[PDB]
């Protein structure tokens, strides 16, 4: 189906404890493939997926160079934003950036992205048109002015429509064994009595990839949207994900409850029940 590529960057100032820390990672869909940490022994972008290792020394040198440049511009920007927000140089602040593209089954650009946040809040973002900007405040408006005057959008658009989609397609082919293989969830329902009056029914989904999945409980065919406890999809550590949903059902009424599982790796949505 559709795929995506994303580069995530975080810079965190730490006054009195050296220069800001910089960490960036790259993903294709939900697979981490490259990382860089300014605090590592000899900072260099490293592979985190097998299909990227085949890239040549030139690839890695350029990537490492870009990471370091970004690290440097973030340090300058952190100082700049202190001014924009009339803030003291005593506190720790955060600058976050994400950019990348989404491509459809045919490998055509579906959407491009480029957004920044300061201290966890929206700062400035490139609009879906890849030509205009949305500034969160008067401070961000100043950055907008600089970027428009510098034609940043034009260049970003060029990358997003070109290199971004091209290399994503290249990565999808080189790592097809894994990037184009969906591991359906292994599912089951557990039952834990709470008291004489009720019990806990928990629907499990394990070892699935990609992360996207829908788990829902029904009582007599009615979605328990309001009465369902759903934990955040979590990484198992081996590339796959896990998740569960649970409801508190009046003891004896377990059979009126059905769990429904939707995952692209499943030919058809699943329906599970507690089998005592």
């Amino acid at each position: 189906g559709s795929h995506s590529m994303r580069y995530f960057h975080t810079s965190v100032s730490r006054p009195g404890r050296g220069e800001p820390r910089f960490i960036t990672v790259g993903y294709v869909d939900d697979t981490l493939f490259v990382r860089f940490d300014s605090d590592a022994a000899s900072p260099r972008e490293e592979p985190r997926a097998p299909w990227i290792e085949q890239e040549g020394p030139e690839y890695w040198d350029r990537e490492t160079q870009i990471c370091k440049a970004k690290a440097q511009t973030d340090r300058e920007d952190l100082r700049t934003l202190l001014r924009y927000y009339n803030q003291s140089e005593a506190g720790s602040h955060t600058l976050q950036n994400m950019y990348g593209c989404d491509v459809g089954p045919d490998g055509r650009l579906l959407r491009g992205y480029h957004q920044n946040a300061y201290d966890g809040k929206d700062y400035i973002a490139l609009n879906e048109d890849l030509s205009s900007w949305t500034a969160a405040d008067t401070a961000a408006q100043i950055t907008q002015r600089k970027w428009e005057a510098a034609r940043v959008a034009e260049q970003l658009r060029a990358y997003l429509e070109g290199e971004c989609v091209e290399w994503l397609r290249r990565y999808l082919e080189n790592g097809k064994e894994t990037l184009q293989r969906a591991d359906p969830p292994k599912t089951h329902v557990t039952h834990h009595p709470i008291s004489d009056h009720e019990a806990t029914l928990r629907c499990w989904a394990l070892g699935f990839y990609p992360a996207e999945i829908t788990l829902t409980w029904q009582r007599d065919g009615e979605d328990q949207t309001q009465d369902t406890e759903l934990v955040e999809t979590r990484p198992a550590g081996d590339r796959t994900f896990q998740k569960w949903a649970a409801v508190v059902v009046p003891s004896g009424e377990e059979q009126r409850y059905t769990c429904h599982v939707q995952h692209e790796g499943l030919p058809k949505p699943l329906t599970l029940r507690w089998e005592p």
């Binding site: 580069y7 790259g26 690839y59 350029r62 990537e63 870009i66 990471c67 440049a69 970004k70 511009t73 300058e76 920007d77 700049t80 934003l81 950019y99 920044n116 700062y123 400035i124 950055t143 600089k146 970027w147 510098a150 940043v152 260049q155 970003l156 990358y159 997003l160 290199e163 971004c164 290399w167």
Partner: peptide, 10 residues
Amino acid sequence: KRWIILGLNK
């Protein structure tokens, strides 16, 4: 593959 526009500051 990453993108880069030299000197892009906020």
